[model samples]
Target: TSWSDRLQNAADMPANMDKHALKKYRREAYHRVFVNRSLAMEKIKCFGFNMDYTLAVYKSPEYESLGFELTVERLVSIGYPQELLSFAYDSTFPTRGLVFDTLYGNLLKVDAYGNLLVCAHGFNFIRGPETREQYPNKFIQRDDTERFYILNTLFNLPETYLLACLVDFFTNCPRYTSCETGFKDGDLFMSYRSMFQDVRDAVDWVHYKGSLKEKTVENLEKYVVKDGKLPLLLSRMKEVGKVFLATNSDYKYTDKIMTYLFDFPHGPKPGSSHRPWQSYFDLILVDARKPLFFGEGTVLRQVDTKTGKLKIGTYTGPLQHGIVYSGGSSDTICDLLGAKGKDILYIGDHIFGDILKSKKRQGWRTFLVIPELAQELHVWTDKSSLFEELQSLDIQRRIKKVTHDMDMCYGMMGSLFRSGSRQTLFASQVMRYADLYAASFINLLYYPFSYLFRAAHVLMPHES
Candidate 1:
């Protein structure tokens, strides 16, 4: 075909495709469950879930703000300056999967290969020329755990923002002397490493010791996203195979959250008789201490449901129905349930704790729940034209501008899954560990029990 004819055909393509094909694609794309590895649902004899973000998705911005505020208070209580009290949580400031460089105190966004995509010193974005001054090679050794901390979970989002806020606060404060690695006030000097540790401890204290859980429990409707679909999804999964919850949260908190999640007047579906949240699951385990749970977990202790306390000693018995467990290894579940690793499909939101370790150690089929994916998909769909334009004629200036625009739609750091055209380290990890993924595990309700989730045919550079 002539160049003019090809141009004419390209212009007419959407109209032609939209007749029925594009319409179906657009409708199904958002709700569809994506597959990394081919998984046959029929073979999944057990369906395991992580409770926090998997079963109980917290309301965004509100939950992040609550965590941020509680963490800030904890820091102030421990001797951080009162100016930190002025640092309110800005939801747009941070993204998941970012690496915080404690040595230089920069938040870095890197591609799958560890090449720097974006670099930020506090709120100030470091462009390529300036970024190269510190990151000489514009690449990072991601495996340096002592120096680099990867914020890979939804729970980490709040602390991620706090880290940046602290960096910005210390750097700009006239009273504090900003050094190459840390800040100094009077005779006392605080390294960024120490500051990072303090922030991490404060965040942990907020969750485990402070009023975060208390406040969340007090106003459940505000922090928690209650969905009738959750119970329905679990009940349906139970009908086909065993269902279980293995969470790091203690049983009492789990009970409260699970109770609120299933507080609907009806049962799984509307107009049916109501049932307790525990009834939907075949197994209920709390304080799972996952990553460890996949390995040789702590002693398996049975919980006294009435008092919400662990029994005298480790309970040496078969896994009983309706009894909730405190801690048990993966083998305990496999042996007790009479299922193999591949027979179970473990679903969760945490990349390392829930999905990676489970898949790596136990060989459990994995389903990752990415709440941010819903918004990511929306942006990808709405900005298709901009993406296409960039593809046709890529320019450094235009690329940065377009990527920034796209990033702003999601957060200050950009999409969690991508940096420009390259897949992020998080995206690569998801593809490697998660056999299946979707915006919510509740999306499973839309699929049949016997469905075969076929992986998309991905092409390599040579193939293309």
Candidate 2:
């Protein structure tokens, strides 16, 4: 009835809501832009989806695992110490991109262009020139050294593709405790703190070493090709009013990927299992390249699907109301859909890219599909003893939070931390489950730490 009463009611949510209830509540908050699923099916006009790690998952665990294996193999082949291979899979490892060999260990994150959003230890060797000076021997042990440096460094090693986690790690501190999560204390986190640039600038990581090349290529390809189509085609058809996509991808690769993704099918779907995919959006707009598309008045072009050619058109000055492409520059889609921006339902995996950016740029509806929420829900809701359950089944969740948190704190405290092989693999195993049980248009209210991110926020005013 009153504000305090509502606050009290909300406060009681933790006690009254069971794991499942909490799961649903939290998930909904995370995906607040998306209306109820049934409602989405009935009213939404067009839908755009991410192909990589979303619809198609460009590289499966087995495949990516193989790739990681290859990367490690490369590291070894190229003279990197073979001992580090055992440090893989902390899940704390936010992602592999933008390699750096600085005064400390290898650093990485975001991109080579230098708009740095995240950071991590990269593939470069950990040479101890000054012994303790170059590579501190007691990183993890020194007041969360392992969690911050070694754990975070190794966790943010040249593998984990979890970008959002990396963004949060270097920025935010612990919002939850480790007992609530077993491995968290020894983990790395991905945050939007500051070092996003130093890590991104390392020419070796961005141009020569690390996964940024492939990740960027794939990100751009997927953004343009798979996710870009639905909206573009929808705009062409001019029949339906709604079309959009929710993706965690940044803007740089958005256009490149969308352009390629929308092109005609190059080859059969992975495993030859599904039918050839095509455009599914009226306009899939996310946190894509800003000045290029918006301010610079970048020329718009159409991709020749089969041939993969771009036919540039004169600068239209501004965006049209209802045209669709894999990665749209701004919020013109709302105007196209003949609906209020909030009326649109966009589903994505990243919090900053998909929802946060949209609220700042387009003022539209948002939906974040966190594949791990289901797992979190499953864990928190279980009625087993706190210690027992945490030990028994929540190891993955512990990895989920800690691996990233540790990496986030890397270098802030110490620098000699290295990941535990078993813990890393265990984290990898959990990621597999998170992928399978990934929630789409499902419950998002399970994790309070994550729920806070779900609420829509505008990007910094300077960005767009």
Candidate 3:
């Protein structure tokens, strides 16, 4: 009845609300966001976004499946057999954050430092002694980016699935003979390195020079998820400080996707009039070419939204309404917004670009948009028993045996996998880089703009 009584009741809610109480409580439990570092939301002065997966959450499997089909087509065009075309993209096959060992043709689930967590050769999970033959000392030099490629994003989901498919296909096909790290079609030897490069190139063509973006624009609802909460989130961020869009995608593509994200019936809330997506941001820099954009990027130019192309001259005008930018550095963004690096919070789905690079290079706070968290969290809640058993095992005995006949629940696993308090490499980086992360940016709607998000303390062995 009283404020203090309500506060007391809420404190006991979690413990009492167990046996499937109300839908409100269940929804509250589901929207839980995690924090790695303490971020005072009040201190955040700017909120920036990546247009692709961050703001424009593409509908799963459909997007990845389409991309996968197109990639196989591209491979066939370049002299591969017609059998490649028969491979249908099974959404179940791919797991994100797989590292392809170009030298050994292994798909690895590795730690932050490149210790193998899981290793597979064409769907067969390789054992320790077998893995040692290829990965001496059971380690990889992750810094040698050339030899190992980390499939770190949902955009990479198709290729991650395709890599194993191709490996399996070549190994089984009667026309091709399997080699140590590749395959042989007569005198033509194909190394995994070349195979990786071809897939990478074909994926790039699909995005950059191919029809992926075009198709997405044409059938937006088929590819992208239109969240009404997106406009609401951005609108709130603007009220607190400035907001911007800096995406690697060009203006033409960004325009189509973003316009769709905002093509709703209303503005911030239901029954209100809708506004243009550009209206939500103070600065918009497309063709951002990030990772490098965080570093020194290309020249800053203005966009002619009229033609959806760059203008003839340099972008010398002041930051004004209806103006769009192209190819600018992070420094340019800070300068334009009249803010320092620490004043901004960059949000995106690219772990390396959005969290790692921005935090290390720019000192900006970050919110990693991990769409998989929606499913991963569900698995965690439902399968804590699987983790509890694994946590009790000897760390050295884990790589083999599952061991005590205990198995991890598969599919949609997160980097947050833990062996007791000891986190997987994926978990380590998430704790290291992502200041804040959630299933969707819309989750912010659940918390106040000034909420002080704090991380739970991890106890040391002695403390435990």
Candidate 4:
């Protein structure tokens, strides 16, 4: 059977068999969703989407190319050794739900017990000229990563807040870096700066080889298409409501990706219609600039999709049917839908851009397509019951020891017993070999404690 089927089987297995197995099985089931794609597409008003992997339906294909390109660009600007540029592409790592103090620069992996593993050797960041002379030991000391490193932040980390490989360099995350503070938090500035620098360097590198930018601009065409080659769930929406494509990618990229996903080899995809509601309901909005369009004061400018012409107009003032243009706000969309806030639902991939900023200031109902967390949950659900049972047993066994030690201390009275404390201290082992593996435990540890404490003090207190 396929891994997803196996995962589903594990999820349905007797829940009492093994706790670890149950968790693993459930995670997989949740992440590897096998919904009747047609059914999902038939119910929604507008099948909003997130670009990147969300619409791409990618696995290990071009992302490695993107990541590799990003890394190469960073290394070039940073002046690393020339040989690092040749590192072969590998997509086995760098997944969603993995948080970093920063990325592509300072990456630190936390074990169950919260110890830093420092994947000293399993890294790809340090690169450029052989003569650049890296401190070779930059990550070795506590100098830079010291200020923001906090043990409490990782105490409840779930698996893959990124991967664990001797603490992969250094990156910044809200939990790991206090970048907002005056003190240098490795999680913030440096992490993103490195990524952007890499992109810049790569752009420069590609510029030397003819015109790649125009090609990229051209390729965007293949990236966005609403009706064609959409997710099965999107097709399902057709049964109950309308599904339209609203994206930052212009209609051209939409057409290309639609061709790739829905179109049969050399033939048009099943729902490849270009107009809004031609197959389902109505309206296709592109280049909304989301966030800003939903909030800022930018006026709507109607653009002719056929000739790329522009004319300023209100949402309803001029009938620019099928013509593409830009600039709009929350009111514009609501006005088009003819639905109020609660009645109309807005779904998007970006939590901050497409969801929050708009909803925060405008009060729109939102559905988040958190593909990373969804994937993780799916994987976890697929794990066998035995795995979960073993994990639970280990925790129970530790609790028993701690309870026994507490009894012993009570009997001895007036003093803390070394034997009791020593036996209890082994929780560090539980955190490793079992939970966080490095040192800290994520939801597995903290959740239980929070429940017992009335859930009043379990807010995870921002460790960074």
Query: What do the candidate models score in CA lDDT, each in turn?
Result: 0.84, 0.35, 0.77, 0.37
Higher-ranked by TM-score: 1 or 4:
1
Off by over 4 Å in 2: 1-46, 58-64, 70-241, 244-276, 283-298, 313-328, 383-438, 442-464
Candidate 3, 141-227: lDDT as tens digits: 989988889888889989988898889888899999988879999999999999989999999988877888777788986777776
TM-score of each: 0.92, 0.41, 0.89, 0.50
Q: By summed lDDT, which 10 consecutive residues of candidate 4 come out lowest?
A: 433-442
Using TM-score as the measure, name the better of candidate 1 and candidate 3.
1
Measured with C-alpha atoms, the lDDT of residue 66 in candidate 3 is: 88
Measured by lDDT, the strongest candidate is 1
> After TM-score superposition, what is the CA distance of residue 203 in candidate 4 from its true location, in Å?
7.9
Top candidate on TM-score is: 1
Q: Which RMSD does model 4 reach against the true structure?
A: 14.9
The lDDT-based order of candidates, best leading, equals: 1, 3, 4, 2
* Predicted candidate 2 versus true structure: per-residue lDDT over 160-262, tens digit per residue: 3322223233223354222211213246422222223323333234434556446546454321113322332333323444445533343334445545544
TM-score (C-alpha, index-matched) for candidate 3:
0.89
